[PDB]
């Protein structure tokens, strides 16, 4: 049995840590809702 616990507000925090890249990928979506890399 699962339960929820409040973790914070939904706010944009100015001068948040900025990182990660921006890749363009070709992907398939199956009937199970799994993404997979089309190459």
């Amino acid at each position: 049995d699962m339960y929820i616990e409040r973790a914070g507000d939904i706010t944009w925090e100015k001068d948040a840590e900025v990182t990660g890249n921006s890749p363009r990928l070709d992907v398939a979506l199956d009937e199970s809702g799994d993404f997979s890399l089309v190459e």
């Binding site: 409040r6 706010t11 944009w12 990660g20 890749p23």
Partner: protein, 156 residues
């Protein structure tokens, strides 16, 4: 229960200890998360019970107590923030520029941030603060790193 707008952890005791299986958004009385987090199961909040109202395995989405409420979308241009809620660790904004999932049906935002599975369901925000979808369904790339779609539902 707690019906207050904001972000939540999704916990189970069914394993060892209290294990965080995911994250979700409460908005307008409705809880939004990813199907693979709950598998459609009901949720406890105080004594309060939360029962599923809508879901789709293929979108990998599920709402509790009412229809899907989050309609805002990534504009294709601006930076966003992952409001990342990892297990045992405090909610924390990461700013990032989304890449693209290119699919035979269309193009979706992709956020390339690497975080545990229990983070699945953390919300993605535009500059106005609105949720433009949820982090935690996607793909492992050449590097061994993880990239998530921006997953958004429809609002009737």
């Amino acid at each position: 229960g707690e019906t207050t707008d904001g972000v939540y952890r999704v916990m189970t005791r069914r394993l060892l200890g209290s294990t965080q299986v995911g994250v979700g958004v409460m908005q307008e009385g409705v809880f939004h998360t990813m199907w693979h987090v709950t598998k459609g199961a009901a949720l406890r909040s105080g004594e309060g019970r939360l029962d599923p109202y809508w879901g789709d395995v293929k979108q990998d989405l599920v709402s509790y107590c009412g229809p899907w409420k989050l309609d805002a979308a990534w504009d294709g241009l601006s930076e966003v923030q992952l409001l990342a809620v990892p297990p045992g660790e405090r909610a924390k904004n990461i700013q990032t520029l989304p890449g693209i999932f290119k699919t035979k049906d269309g193009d979706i935002g992709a956020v390339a941030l690497d975080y545990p599975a229990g983070t699945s369901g953390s919300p993605i925000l535009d500059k106005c603060g609105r949720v433009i979808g949820l982090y935690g369904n996607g793909v492992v790339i050449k590097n061994g790193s993880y990239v998530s779609a921006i997953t958004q539902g429809k609002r009737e």
